[PDB]
């Protein structure tokens, strides 16, 4: 009953967030086993921000230049290294609340929970999709740098995102946990613009499948289409290409509802040309693209995370 942009429970990740200070900069880090991960821009200053020389800044740093705090407990830094745009501080204590975890680099269209933090202290949680243009539509205030995005699959926490930069554009950008940025962005405080964004077609379809499971079925029609003819309409309304791979990923939902994917594609073709005509779908007056096929299944199945 009902359908919401639903985040994962944050409890496992809250237990991993610490405060990291270097100079006058404080931001958040992720404490897993005996390593703390944070944005390397913690080692810049104001003077440096615009165009820092990270290699040089790091060489000149020693362990005592870093202050790491888990609540009030000071964690002693016993080693420092840089992996792409992420700083890794070795500490003397393994985090006893370390959940089983992996690091994954996510693909555009895939979603995750952002745990927004300030000064090592979790503040808020919301869902995001990695956009086609490699931005996210987040909400981040000062000191949110090092906030991470994650998925939970069984017991296992998969970290896919760490927040590095807010550009005066309104643009949010970050890295995987190996420090490689999503998109062409760099950790330099300068105007950087995203390429133009597109709608995530496969997700739109997943969400129409969610509509049907919840008994909102007015948009369904008798028409059908080929993939190629659909993609000729995809590209006109600024939609990502629907691959054959996508069509097959929408199999489980097609079976559970007994509506064929290409039919649902036909129903989508019609909603694009004709608009909604004052109507809504699952309480929205536009086509939602930030729910994946897994997301729909998760929410409609009531999966839990222990």
Which C-beta is closer to its own copies: that of 7 or that of 186? Answer: 7
Which C-beta is closer to its own copies: that of 195 or that of 283? Answer: 283
**Stretch near its own copies under the rule CB under 8 A, chosen from 61-69, 101-109, 166-174, 219-227:** 166-174
Does 292 bind its own copies (CB under 8 A)? Our answer is: no
Which C-beta is closer to its own copies: that of 9 or that of 79? Answer: 9
Q: Measured on CA atoms in the order 201, 203, 205, 211, is the torsion positive or negative?
A: negative
Let me know if 164 is a catalytic residue: no
Which C-beta is closer to its own copies: that of 166 or that of 247? Answer: 166
Does 206 bind its own copies (CB under 8 A)? Our answer is: no
Shortest distance, position 233 Cβ to its own copies, whole Å = 18
What is the separation of C-alpha 150 from the centre of its chain, rounded to a whole number of angstroms?
7
218-237 positions binding its own copies, by CB under 8 A: none
Q: Print the SS3 string covering 112-123.
A: EEEEEEECCEEE
Does 258 bind its own copies (CB under 8 A)? Our answer is: no
Does 297 bind its own copies (CB under 8 A)? Our answer is: no
Cβ-based neighbour number of residue 289 at 10 Å:
22
Q: Which helix (H) or strand (E) holds 47?
A: helix 46-49
Does 143 bind its own copies (CB under 8 A)? Our answer is: yes
Q: Which residue among the candidates 22, 128, 145, 160 is catalytic per the annotation?
A: 145
Shortest distance, position 153 Cβ to its own copies, whole Å = 12
Let me know if 145 is a catalytic residue: yes
Cα–Cα distance, 245 to 257 (Å, whole number): 19
Strand pairing report for 101-103 and 156-167: parallel
Cα–Cα distance, 181 to 164 (Å, whole number): 9
Q: How distant, in Å, are the alpha carbons of 78, 92, 143 from that of 164? A: 24, 26, 10
Partners of 79 in beta bridges: 90
108-127 positions binding its own copies, by CB under 8 A: 115-119, 121-126
Does 4 bind its own copies (CB under 8 A)? Our answer is: yes
Does 96 bind its own copies (CB under 8 A)? Our answer is: no
What per-residue string of b and e applies to 102-125 under the rule 16 or more CB within 10 Å gives b? eebebebbbbbbbbbbbbbebebb
Q: Residues 262, 224: contact at Cβ < 8 Å?
A: yes
Q: Catalytic positions, please?
A: 41, 145
Interface with its own copies (CB under 8 A): 1-11, 14-15, 71, 115-119, 121-126, 137-144, 166-167, 170-172, 214-215, 275-276, 278, 280, 282-286, 298-300, 302-306
């Amino acid at each position: 009953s009902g359908f919401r942009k639903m985040a994962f429970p944050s409890g496992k990740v809250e237990g991993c967030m610490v405060q990291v200070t270097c100079g006058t900069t404080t931001l958040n880090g992720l404490w897993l086993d005996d390593v703390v991960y944070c944005p390397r821009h913690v080692i810049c200053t104001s003077e440096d921000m615009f165009n820092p020389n990270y290699e040089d800044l790091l060489i000149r740093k020693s362990n005592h230049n870093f202050l790491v705090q888990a609540g009030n407990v000071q964690l002693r830094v016993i080693g420092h290294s840089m992996q792409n745009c992420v700083l890794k501080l070795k500490v003397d204590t393994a985090n006893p609340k370390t959940p089983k975890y992996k690091f994954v680099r996510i693909q555009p269209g895939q979603t995750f929970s952002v745990l927004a933090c300030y000064n090592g202290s979790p503040s808020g949680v919301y869902q995001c999709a990695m956009r086609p243009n490699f931005t996210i539509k987040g909400s981040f205030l000062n000191g949110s740098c090092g906030s991470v995005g994650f998925n939970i699959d069984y017991d296992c926490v998969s970290f896919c995102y760490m927040h590095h930069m807010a550009f005066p554009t309104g643009v949010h950008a970050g890295t995987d946990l190996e420090g490689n940025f999503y998109g062409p962005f760099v950790d330099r405080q300068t105007a950087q613009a995203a390429g133009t964004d597109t709608t995530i077609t496969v997700n739109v379809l997943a969400w129409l499948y969610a509509a049907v499971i919840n008994g909102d079925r007015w948009f369904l029609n008798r028409f059908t289409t080929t993939l190629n003819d659909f993609n000729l309409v995809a590209m006109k309304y600024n939609y990502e290409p629907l691959t054959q791979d996508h069509v097959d990923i929408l199999g489980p939902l097609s079976a559970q509802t007994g509506i064929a994917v290409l039919d649902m594609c036909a129903s989508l073709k019609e909603l694009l040309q004709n608009g909604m005509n004052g109507r809504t779908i699952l309480g929205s007056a536009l086509l939602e693209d930030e729910f994946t096929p897994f997301d729909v299944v998760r929410q409609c199945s009531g999966v839990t995370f222990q």
